[PDB]
Each structure stands twice: as C-alpha cells, then as structure tokens.
C-alpha cells in the first residue's frame, strides 16, 4: 500500500459496570485485562512502528467528552503518534486503586449504544490528516449481545457497522471472558471479519516484542542491461540489514532541548573561516606531498554508469560459500521503468533455475561507487507450510570478493583424526541436534537497550532485565549429552591443559 500512509489502531473498551468489577475469581479482571492488553500493545508499538497512530476511547461511561458531545463516550487519548505521555495515562488506571480512580473520574458505566460508538470512532479516523495505510478498530467487551432489549438500536448497529466496513475501516473484537455468553454468532457474525470463553487472539497481543519494520522500501532501482542494448528494470531490495540502535540525539543538560550541532572548519593562522572550496585533500607518499580537488577526490571513483552489467553464467558449485563478503540483497523486476521487462526477468529466472547455473554481474549501486562482482543466483519460491510467502522468487545478490580480500592464512599443517573419535563424535553431534529457525534469537544488546529505554521513559519499579536465548543453557548441554567429555578426554587428551 501507499508507503507514506500509516497504520492506525483505535482502542475501545466496554466501560459498563458489566466487566468493571466482574472478577468471578480473584486472579484476573477484564478491565485489568483489557488495559493490560492495551498497555502492552501500545508500548510494543512505541519501539516497533513509532510512525503509526493509536487511540484509546471508552464507551458507556458517565462523564462525557468527544468530538460531537454525545452520551456515554470518552475519548481518553486521541489519535496521534505514540508517546510516553500516554503510557503514563494508561498506567494511571492499572490497579484496584486505579480502577477506583477510573470509576470515580468517568463513571460506573451507564447505558450505551454501539451504533453511536461506531459513529464516533469513525469520526476519530476521519479527523486526522496523515494518510492511513491500514485502519483497524479493536473492541473490548464480552456482552456478546449488546442489547437484546431495543431491536432498533441493533438494526442501526448493523447499518452503521456495514457502512464502516465500506468506508475502508475494519473492525475486530476479541471475546475476552464471560460466565457463559462467549459466542460470536450472537449479533457479531455479521460484524467482525468455533468459540470459547477466552480469545487466543488477545494472547498474542501480549507477546511484548520490540522489533521494528520498514515497508517495501526499494533500496535502489537500477536498470539491469543484458548487453549494450537490452536493458531491464530491477529493484535492488534488502532482506537483511543488521539493525543498529537508533542514533541518539544530543540534548541540553537541564533544558532537555535539542542542541543543533554546528560543526565547522576554520583557520589556525588567522581567525578566518574556511569555506568548502577553500580546502584541499592530501596524502603523503615517498616523502612527498600530494594535492587534489575535493571534487577530484570523488572523481577518482567514476567507473561506470549506475546499473547492472551481466557478462556470463557460472555453475552454482563454483560460487562458493567460503567467500562471503557483504550482506546479500534481492533482485525483483520493477515494471515501472522499462515496460515488459518483467517478462525477460521471469524468463531468465526460470531458465537459469532449470539449468542450475549462476549469473554474474557488475554492480554499481549509485554514482561515485567502484563496481563489485555480484552473482544473480536464482531463488525458487516456497510456500508449503501455509501457502504464505517464505522465500521470495527472484535472484540473490551474492557479492563476490575481490583479490585484495583473501587475507592469506598463516599456513599450518593438518593432523587426521582416528575413525574411533569421529565415530563417537557422530553420536556427539547427533545428540546436540536442534532445529534452527531464522527468527530464533534476539540481540541482547538491542533488546536490552530498548528495554532500558522504556525503563527510563516510565521509571517503572525496576528495568525489565530481559534474559535472551543468546546465552547457552548450560545444564542442558551437560545433561542431554552425558559425560562424554571425559570419554573424549581419555581418547585424545594428555594431562596438560
């Protein structure tokens, strides 16, 4: 969808006396559950997609304010970019004392009408000016029949909800919890896009993740040309990036204001001010000095116009894993520049896959960049698990190292092992099996940095101090393999360390 557009999620909780103090047992509370869900998802969205929009608005309350001054509707925080000033507002309600505050500030929960609730949350989406990529509404209620008493209210409810379904807005409820009354065919089968007393769909909204994402962002579009005449349009995209911590901003010590760094360069002999034209680049070779233009120090790189230079093809066994150089990239046609080039792209991909052969190219990502040698190794698509995209179809960009990279190894001799040790190592390596999944692990540094960020943003009673799968679970290795370390010691270990 339109990239500049942004995701928008509005939060809407049943504020009636129904679930404010349901608390059948003393281990949970639906309001203490819904607010927990909202806080968790909203803090996750802080780090994840800080560019997006969230809003929380309660219905059925007794105090009133909204855009249209209606009855029993409270817009707690409007639609805006997420921030701590609202983390605190939500946190103010978390607690039995907090629920006391909520009830004596907005109300026990009066009469309501989800028609007017849909009417008003629609107004919230309408209000804000930034374009919206996706628009989702989350209800939080368990009164599976909003009203079996006034059918006219319910008819107007279907009408307005169907309208929202056709104004571009989706709607969603997770059935939180109710003694009985845990069904969706009662008035909601026609609303949302078998059933039980609790929603799995709300459990994952507690998964409490700190990832971040960027949309289908073309890193650079370059025109792959087969020769000097045939040219096709390729979008160099990125599929692994090594996220770094967000770059810090320098702030004034009491005033916490931005400080607008103003680095400059000027003379030492005089109190003048050197201008960018007024400086020269230099090196020192052979006990003699060198001068070039600041313009020339970048002209020393002009090698080829931007694009891709296919020369020939290679067998996929000759392209070796042993000589990785840079994060790989992905190749996919972009129909916009050269119309119809997608056909030729597909032809090359299919036929190369058929003959199990690589494609070699010269890659000049932008101007003023020396070219490297890159392999267009085709990739087949796989969808088998649930018919959802896993490996996008197209070409890799396996960068091929230049000679100056080999880093000649300090040769040492080899000593073969005896087949007895390798035979027992067979069992050793078998025992420590574990299936590896691409998203198995997290950066302890990035995760902990984000965590400390929330900790300071809120002063929540301790920092989270997340423990992460990066550290090995030592007892597991000592146990599930046994004491075979001593076996290999008595096999191939003399007394010295």
């Amino acid at each position: 969808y339109k990239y500049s557009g942004r995701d928008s999620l509005i939060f809407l909780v049943d504020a009636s006396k129904a679930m404010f103090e349901s608390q059948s047992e003393d281990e949970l509370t639906p309001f203490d559950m819904s607010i927990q869900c909202i806080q968790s998802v909203y803090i996750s969205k802080i780090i994840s997609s800080d560019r997006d929009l969230l809003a929380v608005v309660f219905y059925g309350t007794e105090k009133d304010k909204n855009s249209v001054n209606f009855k029993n509707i409270y817009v707690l925080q409007e639609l805006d970019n997420p921030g701590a000033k609202r983390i605190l507002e939500l946190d103010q309600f978390k607690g039995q004392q907090g629920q006391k505050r909520f009830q004596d500030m907005m109300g026990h929960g009066s009469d309501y009408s989800l028609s007017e609730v849909l009417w008003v949350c629609a107004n919230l989406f309408s209000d804000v000016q930034f374009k919206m990529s996706h628009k989702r509404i989350m209800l939080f209620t368990n009164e599976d029949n909003p009203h079996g008493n006034d059918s006219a209210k319910a008819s107007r409810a279907r009408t307005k909800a169907g309208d929202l379904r056709d104004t571009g807005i989706f709607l969603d409820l997770m059935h939180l919890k109710k003694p009985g009354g845990f069904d969706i065919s009662l008035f909601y089968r026609d609303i949302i896009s078998v059933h039980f007393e609790e929603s799995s769909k709300l459990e994952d909204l507690l998964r409490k993740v700190r990832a971040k994402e960027t949309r289908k962002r073309a890193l650079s579009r370059l025109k792959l040309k087969l020769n000097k005449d045939i040219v096709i349009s390729v979008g160099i995209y990125n599929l692994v990036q090594k996220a770094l911590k967000p770059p810090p901003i320098k702030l004034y010590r009491e005033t916490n204001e931005p400080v607008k760094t103003k680095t400059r360069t000027f003379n030492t002999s005089t109190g003048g001010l050197l201008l960018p034209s007024d400086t020269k680049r230099s090196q020192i070779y052979g006990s003699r000095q060198i001068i070039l233009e600041k313009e020339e120090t970048e002209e020393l790189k002009r090698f080829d116009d931007p694009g891709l230079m296919l020369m020939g093809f290679k067998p996929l066994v000759l392209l070796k894993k042993h000589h990785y150089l840079r994060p790989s990239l992905f190749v996919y046609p972009e129909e916009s520049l050269v119309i119809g080039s997608s056909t030729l792209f597909s032809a090359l991909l299919i036929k190369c896959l058929e003959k199990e052969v690589a494609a070699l190219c010269r890659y000049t990502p932008r101007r003023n960049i020396p070219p490297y040698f890159v392999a267009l190794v085709p990739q087949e698509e796989e969808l088998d698990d649930q018919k959802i995209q896993v490996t996008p179809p197209g070409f890799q960009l396996v960068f091929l190292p230049f000679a100056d990279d080999k880093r000649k190894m300090p040769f040492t001799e080899k000593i073969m092992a005896t087949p007895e040790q390798v035979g027992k190592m067979k069992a050793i390596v078998e025992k420590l099996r574990f299936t590896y999944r691409s998203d198995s692990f997290e950066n302890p540094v990035l995760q902990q940095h984000f965590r400390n960020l929330e900790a300071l943003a809120l002063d929540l009673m301790e920092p989270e101090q997340a423990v992460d799968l990066t550290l090995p679970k030592v007892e597991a290795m000592n146990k599930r393999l046994g004491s075979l370390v001593d076996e290999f010691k008595e096999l191939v270990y003399p007394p010295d360390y």
Partner: protein, 511 residues
C-alpha cells in the same frame, strides 16, 4: 619482516638497437623498472631500494678501478624509495655506447649489501639484474658469488630479452651460463627464475596488491561446560578500505596544522552557544518525546558479557541455514591454536563429523568485552592441505525483514512464450562464462574474480602516480588495461552477438 632491493640495469650499446616491431630491451626494461619502483613506492612496505645502472660510459661506484669493478654508476644506495628517484630514472638515464660485464655489477651490489644490510637491521635480501646478455664475462668468481649469495641470503634473478618457449651465440652461451648459475644457486627450479621482458610486463602491469596481515586471536571454543578447546580465529574476507585517509589541507599554504575542524554546539534560541563537552547529555527518541538518557547511565545499564564466549549453542542441518541469510561483516576462519596437537585432532574430528553428516554448528560469538555479541553459522571446510572451519554472522530476529513480493508463476500478464524460453536457453548456454575443461570439470573460469585486483585501489594508486609524476595537470581516463581487466574475456563477448540479436526481436523494450 624486512627486505632489501637492489635493481641492476644495463646502459650499454646493444639495447640501443632492436627489431623495429618490438621496443628495445633498453626502453622495455626501462618501463619495467619505472613501474616496479612505482609498486614499491605506493606500497608502504619498508623495502629499501638501491639501483645499479651498470654498463656506464663513465664509472661512479665505491669500488672504482682500472679494470676491477669498472663501468658502473650506483644510482643511489639502499634506502627507501621515493618519487624524485623515479623521475630521475625516467629522465637521467641515457643511451650508452659501451659494453660491460654484469658479474662485476653483481659483486658490486653484493658488497653494497654486505656493507649496509648489516649496518641496518634486515631479514632477507634480493638481487635483480636486467641485461641482454651481450657482455664479456669470465666465470671466475661465480662459485664465490653464489657462495656469498647463499651466506649473505641474497636471491639472484635474471631478466632477459629472449623467451624460453633469434639471439647471438654470445647471448646463447650467456643464457646457458645463466641456467648454470641459477641451478648452482637453488636447483632445477632455477629455470623459473629466468624471465623475459614481455612476460615481465604481463606479470607486473597491475599495481601492488594490498596485502593485509590478520591478528592471531586465540579463543576457547566452548561446547557444553566441560569441553573447552583453545581455538585460533582468523579473518578470511574483509571489505578492505584504504589505509590512510585523505588529510584535509588548506589551499595555497599546504600545511595540515593550519585547519581546525572544531565543533560548536549552540541553542536554537538567539543562537546561544553551549559549552562544548560538558553541558550536552545524549538522549533517545521514544515516540513523541526524548528521554534524558546519559553516558554514565549507559555504562551502568549497558548489557555485559563474560568475554570471549565463543560457545556452541547447537548443531543443525546444512539446509537448515541458507546462503541468503548470512549476515556477516566479515568471515572468520576457525583453526586450532598451534603447538597443542591434541586440540587440533579434536577439532579435526569435529569438522569431519560435521562434514560427512552435513551438519552445521551455531555458536555465540564475541570478539571481546564491551563489544556486541554475535550468533551465526560455524561452517566446516575441507582442503587437502588442511581442514577448515569458518564463522559468519547470522541474523537476529529484529535484523530479519519480511516482504510480500507478489509471485511470478501467476504470469498471466507476462506470459513467457516458448520462443522466448528456448531463446533464453540459447543465451544461458551460449554466454556460458564457465565451460568444462581438461575433463576435470574445472570450467572455463577465466574470470575467477577471486584473483582480480579491486579496481578502486588500482584507480587510486594510478591517480596518485599521475598527479605525483606531474605538477598540476588534468586527470587521465581509466587505463585500458584496467578496463580489459574488468570486462569479461573477449571470447565470451564474441559468442554473445547472435543470441542477444535473437533476443532483440522477441521482447518489448519501452523507453
């Protein structure tokens, strides 16, 4: 390591004439020595260069005599290379009219080495003589000369106009003498130490490769909690960047110290200037607002680690990881710390087991404290000289990205017709850069890209030359040998006209 360089050129008469179709040995070897001095100029290696332009119309050498050590002009003694020496060589040399022996110059350079290579610390010595073998030489001291070369640790090489695979009987018997001398130095392999002048151009044309020594990092390869193994990590491939940066210097004065890149921090209000390095505290963006984090709280709340922590998290199938996902900056090589053989054999057991069972290891990695940890593939490698294991960064989950990328097999709007398909077959078979050779399935990889110098550094050194050898002059274009180097070998381009021609009639190519 250290090395001593003493080049020896002749300035006699015979090299002043040659076949009109090929440049004379004088100018040929002259370009050769010029660009060789270029090599050891750009490379910052501590090699010290001396020059002996024997066969001189005069005699300017420390060992001057009436007939002993005659007709030699030592250009300059064994010190560092520098530009003005190169320029003088390019200019001061003159065509000669005499003929002189080269054993003379060989012993003279021998004496120079014995007189200087001990006065300053050295490790290995090299003597190189360029000539055309048109000299009158006696075999008197050859035994003693080779003896001293063995004792003084000097390697002798000769470079001659003819090719091993039309010269005078003088030159022919000189060539036989040269073979005798080289074999009298090293052995039968002395044949390879014979060199022509065209092949010298071919083997020398490129600028000096930027050799780069790695660091012996030893680490404790940890598996479980009771099978620690000393492991020596080494880097294999690294995106190489130039060593010393482009120093910024002021025009018309050309001093570095006359410029200060001082940074000043101001406030947005009335352009108030903040005190440079104590009033600023670093913040971070958390949604709308900025959290006053700091540096002290950074070092206090930062994640910590035990240290090296190269500990194996587990083992997995080869296909369980893939080429695409390799997320490294650099690719390590994982070898045993030397002198502990039992460790080496244990590691060999590890590697071979992983190989035959196509299993791959996943190890937590960290170069040291205060550095971000790291998890990735530990791939094992086999070479007849030695087994190998390599480590590469593999992504953390936040680093992985996901995209839809609407598929292609839905090509009801693109429709790769069979004519186009068999066309592309003709292409990918015809432009096949690699084709099987020697019945060993070593395909036509006359584009390895693994032996090819990085053209960036080539252009950088060429620029530094062309604007060093000259005062202010406009820059030159890319030297055609660089382009021929970068372009594919010609035969592939030749085979490609017809298939691309049949392409151009089978697809749309809108603007």
């Amino acid at each position: 390591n250290k090395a001593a360089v003493v080049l020896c050129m002749d300035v006699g008469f015979t090299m002043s004439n040659s076949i009109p179709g090929i440049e004379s040995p004088f100018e040929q070897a002259k370009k050769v020595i010029t660009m060789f001095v270029q090599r050891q100029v750009f490379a910052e290696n501590k090699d010290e260069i001396a020059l002996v332009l024997f066969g001189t119309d005069g005699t300017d050498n420390p060992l001057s005599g009436g007939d002993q050590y005659q007709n030699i002009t030592v250009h300059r003694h064994l010190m560092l290379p520098d530009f003005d020496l190169l320029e003088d060589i390019e200019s001061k040399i003159q065509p000669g009219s005499q003929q002189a022996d080269f054993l003379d110059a060989l012993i003279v350079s021998m004496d120079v080495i014995q007189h200087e290579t001990i006065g300053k610390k050295f490790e290995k010595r090299h003597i190189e003589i360029f000539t055309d073998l048109s000299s009158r030489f006696s075999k008197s001291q050859l035994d003693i000369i080779i003896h001293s070369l063995k004792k003084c640790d000097i390697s002798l090489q000769f470079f001659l106009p003819f090719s091993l695979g039309g010269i005078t009987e003088q030159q022919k018997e000189g060539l036989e003498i040269v073979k005798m001398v080289m074999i009298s130095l090293e052995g039968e392999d002395g044949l390879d130490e014979i060199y022509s002048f065209s092949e010298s151009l071919r083997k020398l044309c490129v600028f000096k490769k930027i050799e780069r020594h790695s660091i012996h990092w030893p680490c404790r390869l940890t598996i479980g909690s009771n099978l620690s193994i000393r492991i020596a990590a080494y880097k294999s491939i690294l995106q190489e960047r130039v060593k010393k940066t482009w120093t910024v210097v002021d025009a018309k004065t050309l001093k570095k110290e006359d410029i200060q890149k001082e940074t000043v921090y101001c406030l947005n209000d009335d352009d108030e200037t903040e005190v440079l390095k104590e009033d600023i505290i670093q913040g971070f963006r958390y949604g709308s607002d900025i959290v006053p984090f700091s540096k002290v709280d950074e070092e206090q709340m930062k994640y910590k680690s035990e240290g090296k922590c190269f500990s194996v998290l587990g083992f997995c199938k080869s296909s369980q990881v893939q080429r695409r996902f390799f997320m490294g900056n650099q690719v390590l090589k994982v070898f045993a710390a030397r002198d502990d053989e039992a460790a080496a054999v244990a590691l060999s057991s590890l590697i071979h087991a992983l190989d035959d069972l196509d299993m791959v290891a996943i190890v937590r990695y960290a170069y040291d404290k205060r550095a971000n940890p790291q998890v990735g593939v530990a791939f094992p490698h086999i070479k007849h000289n030695y087994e190998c294991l390599v480590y590469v960064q593999l992504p953390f989950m936040e680093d992985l990205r996901q995209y839809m990328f609407s598929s292609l097999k839905n090509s009801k709007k693109y429709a790769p017709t069979e004519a186009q398909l068999n066309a592309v077959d003709a292409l990918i078979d015809s432009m096949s850069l690699a084709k099987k050779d020697e019945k060993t399935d070593t395909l036509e990889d006359l584009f390895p890209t693994t032996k090819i110098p990085n053209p960036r550094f080539q252009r950088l050194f060429q620029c530094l030359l062309h604007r060093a050898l000259h005062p202010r002059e406009p820059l030159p274009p890319i030297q055609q040998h660089i382009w021929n180097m970068l372009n594919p070998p010609a035969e592939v381009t030749t085979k490609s006209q017809i298939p691309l021609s049949k392409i151009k009639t089978l697809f749309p190519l809108i603007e």
